[PDB]
Amino acid sequence: RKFFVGGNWKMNGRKQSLGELIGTLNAAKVPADTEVVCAPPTAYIDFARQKLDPKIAVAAQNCYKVTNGAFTGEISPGMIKDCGATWVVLGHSERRHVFGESDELIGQKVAHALAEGLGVIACIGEKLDEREAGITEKVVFEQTKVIADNVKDWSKVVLAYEPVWAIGGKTATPQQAQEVHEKLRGWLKSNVSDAVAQSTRIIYGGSVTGATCKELASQPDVDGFLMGGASLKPEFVDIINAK
Amino acid sequence: RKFFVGGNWKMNGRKQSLGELIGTLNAAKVPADTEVVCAPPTAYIDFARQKLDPKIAVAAQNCYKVTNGAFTGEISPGMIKDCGATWVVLGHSERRHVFGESDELIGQKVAHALAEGLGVIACIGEKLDEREAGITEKVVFEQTKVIADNVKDWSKVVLAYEPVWAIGTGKTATPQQAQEVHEKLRGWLKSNVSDAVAQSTRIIYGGSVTGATCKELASQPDVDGFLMGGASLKPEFVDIINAK
């Protein structure tokens, strides 16, 4: 399974600062057996794709579920491909929990994006109140099931576990990350196939730094990272070399 | 009051088709007394600004309420200006009614966008169930009040009335019904803000408008222009630019 490092720039950066960041990424050596993807703010997908070297792929941070329509403020998978981007991040914790995107909607988006030829980074995660109630498995399995029901071919899909319970005074240990990733791969093994379980990347979307990345990456069922705003710093190059 | 024509392209188009549309807009003669703004899909704001002639301004279709942050999928007013766009459409009916954007949030967005030096096209409107209950005024006045509470300088603001009750329901709105809402809205501004703001602020019509109806709508005393939907992608848009 190839190491997968996604940098989600979120709502940060301008042409000048992002152009500088891109130059540092273009200059860096991507190791063997490693896949790097960058998700700029929507206004800069096109800009980023033109400036970034082909060795780094570009992702949209969100999309909608039909090709064209009366949806002020949205973008379709067709627009994303037309700008040269090959991935879309779907179901990120901020879309679910700040912007109220339901599992039904996320499923419909997954299906449309895949049908339009995009790769999908599909995000899942449980909140603090869900974890403390002891329904971590119920939550992430129901989220993964909705994704799985809308995926025909898994070769274009990467799963990202976001420990929302620990994003913004509790920290998650590498053992707690491994435990969720293994239960998730176990779910795929039972409900899809062993081939899909074996081959699908499950990446960690919790807090990761240059000092933690190596231990996290060495976990058997952690296949990489979906990094937040820290992906804008020089630190991101250390995470690329976490193996 | 300078006549104002906004074309909201919504979630439509690709570089090729939008590039063709832009060539037609670049070739058209913008009248002297007229201000034309185009709102492309977010992925094409930058593309559209580089291709469009300066005589047409560019608007974002939405934005968020802080300059930078952990808000996957959003863009800030700073990003919009950095791409050469000078306007943002806020509180469009689709953001309110498909995507659940509250009045509180829209107010916060208005304030941040204006503070960052953008112009704002601030949209308001009542649904069918609200109109048939007879609370058209209550709804549009509450929406306009939330906007007004977040506007320090009105010179950068345009109000757009969207008759949501008539967009996509099988009801059509007459030019008399448009005028009635626009005049009550200007009356509200006159009483609750100032006469100067009432007299100078453009109130544009965001309902269904065609080349055959635009002239009668534009001649209404309190209709100052249009925020057109997907019909702004057709040749028809040029007739609307010349509605006066």
Side-chain angles (χ1 to χ4, degrees):
Chain A
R1 280 192 311 273
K2 294 173 182 286
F3 200 45
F4 188 98
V5 180
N8 180 10
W9 304 347
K10 303 193 173 178
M11 194 185 73
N12 296 283
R14 307 293 181 262
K15 280 180 173 173
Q16 196 276 337
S17 60
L18 294 182
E20 285 178 293
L21 173 64
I22 287 162
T24 293
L25 299 202
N26 288 347
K29 181 181 193 291
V30 182
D33 213 54
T34 316
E35 184 163 17
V36 185
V37 184
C38 287
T42 300
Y44 300 127
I45 289 167
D46 189 12
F47 171 81
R49 178 65 283 173
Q50 295 180 72
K51 295 287 138 191
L52 282 159
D53 273 18
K55 69 175 180 200
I56 298 141
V58 173
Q61 292 175 10
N62 199 15
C63 71
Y64 199 54
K65 58 158 171 192
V66 288
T67 193
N68 285 119
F71 304 104
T72 297
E74 303 295 308
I75 63 168
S76 67
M79 295 172 182
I80 292 159
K81 283 175 44 177
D82 186 51
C83 295
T86 55
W87 292 89
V88 62
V89 177
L90 288 177
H92 196 274
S93 44
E94 288 146 20
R95 304 315 310 179
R96 296 175 185 265
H97 307 301
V98 178
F99 297 103
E101 289 191 24
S102 71
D103 276 298
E104 194 181 60
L105 183 55
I106 289 160
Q108 292 164 329
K109 289 174 175 205
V110 167
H112 181 57
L114 292 172
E116 292 282 290
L118 284 183
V120 172
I121 303 157
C123 306
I124 60 183
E126 87 284 16
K127 298 189 75 165
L128 185 269
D129 64 345
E130 293 167 336
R131 187 168 189 94
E132 291 210 341
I135 60 164
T136 288
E137 279 183 26
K138 181 273 219 177
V139 176
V140 301
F141 292 173
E142 188 52 38
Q143 293 174 328
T144 301
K145 188 198 183 304
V146 175
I147 290 159
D149 289 347
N150 290 286
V151 172
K152 308 146 150 45
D153 165 32
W154 282 85
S155 75
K156 300 299 300 279
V157 177
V158 165
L159 279 190
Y161 172 59
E162 303 182 80
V164 184
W165 63 272
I167 302 165
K170 275 196 144 59
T171 57
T173 64
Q175 292 81 264
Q176 286 171 323
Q178 170 59 27
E179 187 153 297
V180 174
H181 283 235
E182 186 195 327
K183 295 167 177 181
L184 278 168
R185 202 181 306 288
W187 189 95
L188 290 164
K189 188 189 200 305
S190 299
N191 296 279
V192 186
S193 73
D194 184 57
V196 169
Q198 286 288 358
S199 59
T200 302
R201 279 78 67 80
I202 310 186
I203 63 177
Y204 180 65
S207 172
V208 281
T209 65
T212 52
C213 76
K214 289 190 112 65
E215 190 160 37
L216 281 293
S218 71
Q219 298 304 312
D221 298 281
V222 177
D223 304 317
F225 309 103
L226 178 62
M227 267 204 99
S231 67
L232 298 161
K233 300 193 268 188
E235 202 172 55
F236 188 65
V237 173
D238 298 326
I239 281 152
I240 283 157
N241 301 288
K243 278 219 220 295
Chain B
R1 289 193 295 274
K2 192 155 160 168
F3 196 61
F4 189 96
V5 180
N8 181 11
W9 304 348
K10 303 191 172 180
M11 197 186 76
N12 295 285
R14 301 300 180 270
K15 280 180 175 182
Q16 197 170 30
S17 60
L18 293 183
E20 286 177 297
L21 173 64
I22 287 161
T24 57
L25 300 197
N26 287 349
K29 183 201 318 300
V30 180
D33 55 49
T34 307
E35 183 167 17
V36 185
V37 185
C38 287
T42 301
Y44 301 126
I45 289 167
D46 189 12
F47 171 82
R49 179 64 284 172
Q50 296 180 73
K51 296 285 164 179
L52 283 160
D53 272 18
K55 68 193 194 180
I56 298 142
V58 174
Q61 291 176 9
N62 199 15
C63 72
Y64 201 53
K65 59 159 172 186
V66 289
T67 191
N68 287 118
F71 303 104
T72 292
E74 303 295 307
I75 69 175
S76 67
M79 296 173 185
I80 292 159
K81 283 190 329 179
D82 185 52
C83 296
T86 55
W87 292 89
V88 62
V89 177
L90 288 177
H92 195 274
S93 43
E94 288 145 21
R95 303 315 310 179
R96 297 174 184 266
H97 307 301
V98 178
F99 297 103
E101 289 191 25
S102 71
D103 276 298
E104 193 187 300
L105 182 56
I106 288 159
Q108 292 164 329
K109 288 175 175 205
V110 168
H112 181 57
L114 292 172
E116 292 282 68
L118 281 183
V120 171
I121 304 158
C123 305
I124 60 177
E126 87 284 17
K127 298 182 279 179
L128 185 52
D129 65 343
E130 293 167 337
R131 187 168 190 96
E132 290 183 320
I135 60 163
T136 289
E137 279 180 31
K138 184 171 151 58
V139 176
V140 300
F141 293 171
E142 281 170 357
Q143 293 173 329
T144 300
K145 187 204 189 297
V146 175
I147 290 160
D149 289 348
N150 290 286
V151 173
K152 295 152 158 60
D153 168 30
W154 282 83
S155 76
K156 306 207 189 188
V157 177
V158 166
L159 276 201
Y161 171 60
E162 304 182 80
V164 184
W165 63 271
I167 302 165
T169 63
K171 277 299 311 308
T172 57
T174 64
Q176 292 81 265
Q177 285 170 324
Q179 170 59 27
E180 187 187 61
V181 174
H182 283 234
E183 187 167 30
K184 295 272 184 30
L185 279 167
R186 202 182 305 288
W188 189 98
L189 290 164
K190 189 174 287 189
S191 189
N192 296 281
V193 183
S194 73
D195 184 56
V197 172
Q199 219 72 37
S200 59
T201 303
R202 279 78 68 80
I203 309 186
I204 63 177
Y205 181 64
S208 169
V209 73
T210 66
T213 53
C214 72
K215 291 191 176 298
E216 186 162 38
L217 276 156
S219 71
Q220 297 304 311
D222 298 281
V223 177
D224 303 318
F226 309 103
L227 178 62
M228 290 197 67
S232 67
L233 297 162
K234 300 192 269 159
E236 204 171 56
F237 188 66
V238 172
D239 298 328
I240 296 151
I241 290 164
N242 302 307
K244 272 173 67 229

PDB file of all heavy atoms in Angstrom, chain B residues 77-103:
ATOM      1  N   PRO B  77     -13.280  36.666   2.040  1.00  0.00           N
ATOM      2  CA  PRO B  77     -13.233  37.895   1.248  1.00  0.00           C
ATOM      3  C   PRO B  77     -11.840  38.277   0.734  1.00  0.00           C
ATOM      4  O   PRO B  77     -11.726  38.776  -0.390  1.00  0.00           O
ATOM      5  CB  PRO B  77     -13.745  38.946   2.235  1.00  0.00           C
ATOM      6  CG  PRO B  77     -14.748  38.194   3.049  1.00  0.00           C
ATOM      7  CD  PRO B  77     -14.122  36.841   3.251  1.00  0.00           C
ATOM      8  N   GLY B  78     -10.802  38.044   1.540  1.00  0.00           N
ATOM      9  CA  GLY B  78      -9.412  38.250   1.116  1.00  0.00           C
ATOM     10  C   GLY B  78      -9.008  37.457  -0.123  1.00  0.00           C
ATOM     11  O   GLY B  78      -8.294  37.960  -0.983  1.00  0.00           O
ATOM     12  N   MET B  79      -9.471  36.212  -0.217  1.00  0.00           N
ATOM     13  CA  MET B  79      -9.199  35.368  -1.391  1.00  0.00           C
ATOM     14  C   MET B  79      -9.887  35.898  -2.635  1.00  0.00           C
ATOM     15  O   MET B  79      -9.313  35.904  -3.724  1.00  0.00           O
ATOM     16  CB  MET B  79      -9.650  33.924  -1.142  1.00  0.00           C
ATOM     17  CG  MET B  79      -8.886  33.223  -0.036  1.00  0.00           C
ATOM     18  SD  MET B  79      -9.586  31.605   0.336  1.00  0.00           S
ATOM     19  CE  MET B  79      -8.568  31.137   1.739  1.00  0.00           C
ATOM     20  N   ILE B  80     -11.119  36.358  -2.449  1.00  0.00           N
ATOM     21  CA  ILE B  80     -11.925  36.908  -3.526  1.00  0.00           C
ATOM     22  C   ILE B  80     -11.251  38.146  -4.135  1.00  0.00           C
ATOM     23  O   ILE B  80     -11.149  38.248  -5.360  1.00  0.00           O
ATOM     24  CB  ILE B  80     -13.358  37.198  -3.025  1.00  0.00           C
ATOM     25  CG1 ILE B  80     -14.063  35.874  -2.717  1.00  0.00           C
ATOM     26  CG2 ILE B  80     -14.169  37.969  -4.046  1.00  0.00           C
ATOM     27  CD1 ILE B  80     -15.242  35.979  -1.786  1.00  0.00           C
ATOM     28  N   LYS B  81     -10.780  39.065  -3.284  1.00  0.00           N
ATOM     29  CA  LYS B  81     -10.045  40.251  -3.761  1.00  0.00           C
ATOM     30  C   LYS B  81      -8.718  39.907  -4.414  1.00  0.00           C
ATOM     31  O   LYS B  81      -8.345  40.524  -5.402  1.00  0.00           O
ATOM     32  CB  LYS B  81      -9.766  41.226  -2.637  1.00  0.00           C
ATOM     33  CG  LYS B  81     -10.960  42.061  -2.216  1.00  0.00           C
ATOM     34  CD  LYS B  81     -10.576  43.199  -1.267  1.00  0.00           C
ATOM     35  CE  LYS B  81      -9.373  42.939  -0.332  1.00  0.00           C
ATOM     36  NZ  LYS B  81      -9.140  44.180   0.487  1.00  0.00           N
ATOM     37  N   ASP B  82      -8.017  38.923  -3.847  1.00  0.00           N
ATOM     38  CA  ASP B  82      -6.744  38.413  -4.376  1.00  0.00           C
ATOM     39  C   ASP B  82      -6.899  37.842  -5.801  1.00  0.00           C
ATOM     40  O   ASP B  82      -5.954  37.880  -6.580  1.00  0.00           O
ATOM     41  CB  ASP B  82      -6.203  37.366  -3.400  1.00  0.00           C
ATOM     42  CG  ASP B  82      -4.815  36.849  -3.772  1.00  0.00           C
ATOM     43  OD1 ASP B  82      -3.887  37.659  -3.994  1.00  0.00           O
ATOM     44  OD2 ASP B  82      -4.647  35.609  -3.801  1.00  0.00           O
ATOM     45  N   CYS B  83      -8.091  37.332  -6.133  1.00  0.00           N
ATOM     46  CA  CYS B  83      -8.411  36.904  -7.496  1.00  0.00           C
ATOM     47  C   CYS B  83      -8.958  38.034  -8.392  1.00  0.00           C
ATOM     48  O   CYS B  83      -9.398  37.768  -9.516  1.00  0.00           O
ATOM     49  CB  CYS B  83      -9.407  35.741  -7.460  1.00  0.00           C
ATOM     50  SG  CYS B  83      -8.781  34.224  -6.698  1.00  0.00           S
ATOM     51  N   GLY B  84      -8.924  39.287  -7.920  1.00  0.00           N
ATOM     52  CA  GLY B  84      -9.383  40.449  -8.706  1.00  0.00           C
ATOM     53  C   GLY B  84     -10.894  40.691  -8.751  1.00  0.00           C
ATOM     54  O   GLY B  84     -11.360  41.552  -9.489  1.00  0.00           O
ATOM     55  N   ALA B  85     -11.655  39.947  -7.952  1.00  0.00           N
ATOM     56  CA  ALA B  85     -13.102  40.149  -7.854  1.00  0.00           C
ATOM     57  C   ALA B  85     -13.375  41.248  -6.840  1.00  0.00           C
ATOM     58  O   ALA B  85     -12.635  41.395  -5.882  1.00  0.00           O
ATOM     59  CB  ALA B  85     -13.809  38.854  -7.465  1.00  0.00           C
ATOM     60  N   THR B  86     -14.439  42.021  -7.061  1.00  0.00           N
ATOM     61  CA  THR B  86     -14.762  43.193  -6.218  1.00  0.00           C
ATOM     62  C   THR B  86     -16.128  43.125  -5.520  1.00  0.00           C
ATOM     63  O   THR B  86     -16.464  44.032  -4.738  1.00  0.00           O
ATOM     64  CB  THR B  86     -14.694  44.480  -7.054  1.00  0.00           C
ATOM     65  OG1 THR B  86     -15.545  44.336  -8.195  1.00  0.00           O
ATOM     66  CG2 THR B  86     -13.266  44.738  -7.540  1.00  0.00           C
ATOM     67  N   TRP B  87     -16.889  42.050  -5.770  1.00  0.00           N
ATOM     68  CA  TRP B  87     -18.203  41.849  -5.177  1.00  0.00           C
ATOM     69  C   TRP B  87     -18.339  40.438  -4.585  1.00  0.00           C
ATOM     70  O   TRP B  87     -17.616  39.517  -4.964  1.00  0.00           O
ATOM     71  CB  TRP B  87     -19.296  42.034  -6.233  1.00  0.00           C
ATOM     72  CG  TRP B  87     -19.437  43.436  -6.741  1.00  0.00           C
ATOM     73  CD1 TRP B  87     -18.770  44.003  -7.793  1.00  0.00           C
ATOM     74  CD2 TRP B  87     -20.318  44.441  -6.239  1.00  0.00           C
ATOM     75  NE1 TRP B  87     -19.177  45.298  -7.969  1.00  0.00           N
ATOM     76  CE2 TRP B  87     -20.119  45.600  -7.019  1.00  0.00           C
ATOM     77  CE3 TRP B  87     -21.250  44.478  -5.197  1.00  0.00           C
ATOM     78  CZ2 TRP B  87     -20.819  46.783  -6.794  1.00  0.00           C
ATOM     79  CZ3 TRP B  87     -21.948  45.656  -4.971  1.00  0.00           C
ATOM     80  CH2 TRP B  87     -21.726  46.794  -5.771  1.00  0.00           C
ATOM     81  N   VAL B  88     -19.292  40.289  -3.669  1.00  0.00           N
ATOM     82  CA  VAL B  88     -19.750  38.985  -3.231  1.00  0.00           C
ATOM     83  C   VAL B  88     -21.280  38.978  -3.067  1.00  0.00           C
ATOM     84  O   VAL B  88     -21.852  39.913  -2.500  1.00  0.00           O
ATOM     85  CB  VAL B  88     -19.041  38.505  -1.928  1.00  0.00           C
ATOM     86  CG1 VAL B  88     -19.312  39.437  -0.748  1.00  0.00           C
ATOM     87  CG2 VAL B  88     -19.463  37.072  -1.602  1.00  0.00           C
ATOM     88  N   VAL B  89     -21.915  37.932  -3.594  1.00  0.00           N
ATOM     89  CA  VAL B  89     -23.336  37.680  -3.406  1.00  0.00           C
ATOM     90  C   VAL B  89     -23.494  36.945  -2.072  1.00  0.00           C
ATOM     91  O   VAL B  89     -22.864  35.917  -1.853  1.00  0.00           O
ATOM     92  CB  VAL B  89     -23.914  36.804  -4.548  1.00  0.00           C
ATOM     93  CG1 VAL B  89     -25.386  36.495  -4.306  1.00  0.00           C
ATOM     94  CG2 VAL B  89     -23.718  37.487  -5.900  1.00  0.00           C
ATOM     95  N   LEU B  90     -24.326  37.482  -1.185  1.00  0.00           N
ATOM     96  CA  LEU B  90     -24.528  36.918   0.149  1.00  0.00           C
ATOM     97  C   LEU B  90     -26.002  36.733   0.436  1.00  0.00           C
ATOM     98  O   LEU B  90     -26.817  37.574   0.074  1.00  0.00           O
ATOM     99  CB  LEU B  90     -23.908  37.809   1.224  1.00  0.00           C
ATOM    100  CG  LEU B  90     -22.388  37.810   1.270  1.00  0.00           C
ATOM    101  CD1 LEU B  90     -21.895  38.785   2.336  1.00  0.00           C
ATOM    102  CD2 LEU B  90     -21.828  36.416   1.531  1.00  0.00           C
ATOM    103  N   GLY B  91     -26.327  35.615   1.076  1.00  0.00           N
ATOM    104  CA  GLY B  91     -27.696  35.295   1.431  1.00  0.00           C
ATOM    105  C   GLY B  91     -28.638  34.949   0.287  1.00  0.00           C
ATOM    106  O   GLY B  91     -29.856  35.074   0.435  1.00  0.00           O
ATOM    107  N   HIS B  92     -28.089  34.497  -0.841  1.00  0.00           N
ATOM    108  CA  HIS B  92     -28.906  34.009  -1.953  1.00  0.00           C
ATOM    109  C   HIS B  92     -29.854  32.919  -1.436  1.00  0.00           C
ATOM    110  O   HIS B  92     -29.519  32.190  -0.497  1.00  0.00           O
ATOM    111  CB  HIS B  92     -28.027  33.455  -3.082  1.00  0.00           C
ATOM    112  CG  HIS B  92     -28.747  33.279  -4.385  1.00  0.00           C
ATOM    113  ND1 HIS B  92     -29.464  32.138  -4.699  1.00  0.00           N
ATOM    114  CD2 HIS B  92     -28.863  34.102  -5.455  1.00  0.00           C
ATOM    115  CE1 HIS B  92     -30.006  32.273  -5.898  1.00  0.00           C
ATOM    116  NE2 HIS B  92     -29.660  33.457  -6.380  1.00  0.00           N
ATOM    117  N   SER B  93     -31.032  32.826  -2.046  1.00  0.00           N
ATOM    118  CA  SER B  93     -32.081  31.888  -1.626  1.00  0.00           C
ATOM    119  C   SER B  93     -31.608  30.428  -1.535  1.00  0.00           C
ATOM    120  O   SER B  93     -32.043  29.687  -0.673  1.00  0.00           O
ATOM    121  CB  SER B  93     -33.288  31.965  -2.582  1.00  0.00           C
ATOM    122  OG  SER B  93     -32.878  32.027  -3.927  1.00  0.00           O
ATOM    123  N   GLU B  94     -30.711  30.035  -2.428  1.00  0.00           N
ATOM    124  CA  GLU B  94     -30.138  28.699  -2.421  1.00  0.00           C
ATOM    125  C   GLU B  94     -29.226  28.449  -1.209  1.00  0.00           C
ATOM    126  O   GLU B  94     -29.259  27.362  -0.627  1.00  0.00           O
ATOM    127  CB  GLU B  94     -29.420  28.428  -3.748  1.00  0.00           C
ATOM    128  CG  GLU B  94     -30.418  28.231  -4.904  1.00  0.00           C
ATOM    129  CD  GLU B  94     -29.966  28.762  -6.243  1.00  0.00           C
ATOM    130  OE1 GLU B  94     -28.758  28.939  -6.447  1.00  0.00           O
ATOM    131  OE2 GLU B  94     -30.838  28.985  -7.100  1.00  0.00           O
ATOM    132  N   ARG B  95     -28.452  29.452  -0.807  1.00  0.00           N
ATOM    133  CA  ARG B  95     -27.693  29.344   0.440  1.00  0.00           C
ATOM    134  C   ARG B  95     -28.625  29.241   1.680  1.00  0.00           C
ATOM    135  O   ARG B  95     -28.375  28.454   2.587  1.00  0.00           O
ATOM    136  CB  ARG B  95     -26.731  30.534   0.619  1.00  0.00           C
ATOM    137  CG  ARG B  95     -25.724  30.783  -0.491  1.00  0.00           C
ATOM    138  CD  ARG B  95     -25.016  29.527  -0.979  1.00  0.00           C
ATOM    139  NE  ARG B  95     -24.454  28.703   0.097  1.00  0.00           N
ATOM    140  CZ  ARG B  95     -23.806  27.557  -0.089  1.00  0.00           C
ATOM    141  NH1 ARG B  95     -23.602  27.079  -1.306  1.00  0.00           N
ATOM    142  NH2 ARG B  95     -23.343  26.884   0.953  1.00  0.00           N
ATOM    143  N   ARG B  96     -29.690  30.038   1.713  1.00  0.00           N
ATOM    144  CA  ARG B  96     -30.636  30.007   2.836  1.00  0.00           C
ATOM    145  C   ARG B  96     -31.449  28.704   2.867  1.00  0.00           C
ATOM    146  O   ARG B  96     -31.536  28.054   3.915  1.00  0.00           O
ATOM    147  CB  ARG B  96     -31.592  31.209   2.798  1.00  0.00           C
ATOM    148  CG  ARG B  96     -30.943  32.580   2.946  1.00  0.00           C
ATOM    149  CD  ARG B  96     -31.978  33.681   2.751  1.00  0.00           C
ATOM    150  NE  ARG B  96     -31.418  35.037   2.785  1.00  0.00           N
ATOM    151  CZ  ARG B  96     -31.332  35.839   3.852  1.00  0.00           C
ATOM    152  NH1 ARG B  96     -31.748  35.460   5.062  1.00  0.00           N
ATOM    153  NH2 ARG B  96     -30.821  37.058   3.709  1.00  0.00           N
ATOM    154  N   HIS B  97     -32.015  28.308   1.719  1.00  0.00           N
ATOM    155  CA  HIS B  97     -33.076  27.289   1.675  1.00  0.00           C
ATOM    156  C   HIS B  97     -32.629  25.887   1.259  1.00  0.00           C
ATOM    157  O   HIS B  97     -33.255  24.913   1.662  1.00  0.00           O
ATOM    158  CB  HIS B  97     -34.238  27.792   0.802  1.00  0.00           C
ATOM    159  CG  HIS B  97     -34.741  29.146   1.213  1.00  0.00           C
ATOM    160  ND1 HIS B  97     -35.236  29.409   2.479  1.00  0.00           N
ATOM    161  CD2 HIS B  97     -34.791  30.323   0.549  1.00  0.00           C
ATOM    162  CE1 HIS B  97     -35.578  30.684   2.567  1.00  0.00           C
ATOM    163  NE2 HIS B  97     -35.315  31.263   1.411  1.00  0.00           N
ATOM    164  N   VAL B  98     -31.573  25.764   0.458  1.00  0.00           N
ATOM    165  CA  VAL B  98     -30.960  24.450   0.194  1.00  0.00           C
ATOM    166  C   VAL B  98     -29.866  24.148   1.225  1.00  0.00           C
ATOM    167  O   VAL B  98     -29.781  23.025   1.706  1.00  0.00           O
ATOM    168  CB  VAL B  98     -30.401  24.330  -1.246  1.00  0.00           C
ATOM    169  CG1 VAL B  98     -29.723  22.981  -1.464  1.00  0.00           C
ATOM    170  CG2 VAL B  98     -31.527  24.503  -2.249  1.00  0.00           C
ATOM    171  N   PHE B  99     -29.050  25.147   1.563  1.00  0.00           N
ATOM    172  CA  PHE B  99     -27.890  24.935   2.429  1.00  0.00           C
ATOM    173  C   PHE B  99     -28.027  25.461   3.861  1.00  0.00           C
ATOM    174  O   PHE B  99     -27.057  25.428   4.611  1.00  0.00           O
ATOM    175  CB  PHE B  99     -26.630  25.481   1.741  1.00  0.00           C
ATOM    176  CG  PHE B  99     -26.305  24.761   0.470  1.00  0.00           C
ATOM    177  CD1 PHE B  99     -26.587  25.327  -0.767  1.00  0.00           C
ATOM    178  CD2 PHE B  99     -25.764  23.475   0.516  1.00  0.00           C
ATOM    179  CE1 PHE B  99     -26.296  24.647  -1.943  1.00  0.00           C
ATOM    180  CE2 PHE B  99     -25.491  22.776  -0.652  1.00  0.00           C
ATOM    181  CZ  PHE B  99     -25.752  23.366  -1.882  1.00  0.00           C
ATOM    182  N   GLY B 100     -29.212  25.926   4.240  1.00  0.00           N
ATOM    183  CA  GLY B 100     -29.509  26.226   5.638  1.00  0.00           C
ATOM    184  C   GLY B 100     -28.743  27.366   6.291  1.00  0.00           C
ATOM    185  O   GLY B 100     -28.626  27.395   7.511  1.00  0.00           O
ATOM    186  N   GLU B 101     -28.217  28.306   5.504  1.00  0.00           N
ATOM    187  CA  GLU B 101     -27.499  29.462   6.065  1.00  0.00           C
ATOM    188  C   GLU B 101     -28.483  30.375   6.803  1.00  0.00           C
ATOM    189  O   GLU B 101     -29.437  30.869   6.209  1.00  0.00           O
ATOM    190  CB  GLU B 101     -26.736  30.239   4.990  1.00  0.00           C
ATOM    191  CG  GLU B 101     -25.512  29.500   4.435  1.00  0.00           C
ATOM    192  CD  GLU B 101     -24.595  30.374   3.565  1.00  0.00           C
ATOM    193  OE1 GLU B 101     -24.587  31.609   3.721  1.00  0.00           O
ATOM    194  OE2 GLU B 101     -23.852  29.816   2.721  1.00  0.00           O
ATOM    195  N   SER B 102     -28.256  30.565   8.102  1.00  0.00           N
ATOM    196  CA  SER B 102     -29.120  31.387   8.956  1.00  0.00           C
ATOM    197  C   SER B 102     -28.904  32.887   8.736  1.00  0.00           C
ATOM    198  O   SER B 102     -27.889  33.305   8.164  1.00  0.00           O
ATOM    199  CB  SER B 102     -28.859  31.063  10.434  1.00  0.00           C
ATOM    200  OG  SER B 102     -27.592  31.549  10.848  1.00  0.00           O
ATOM    201  N   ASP B 103     -29.862  33.683   9.212  1.00  0.00           N
ATOM    202  CA  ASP B 103     -29.745  35.158   9.164  1.00  0.00           C
ATOM    203  C   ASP B 103     -28.554  35.689   9.969  1.00  0.00           C
ATOM    204  O   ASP B 103     -27.866  36.602   9.517  1.00  0.00           O
ATOM    205  CB  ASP B 103     -31.036  35.851   9.637  1.00  0.00           C
ATOM    206  CG  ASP B 103     -32.065  35.983   8.530  1.00  0.00           C
ATOM    207  OD1 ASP B 103     -31.793  36.651   7.515  1.00  0.00           O
ATOM    208  OD2 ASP B 103     -33.160  35.429   8.686  1.00  0.00           O
TER     209      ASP B 103
END
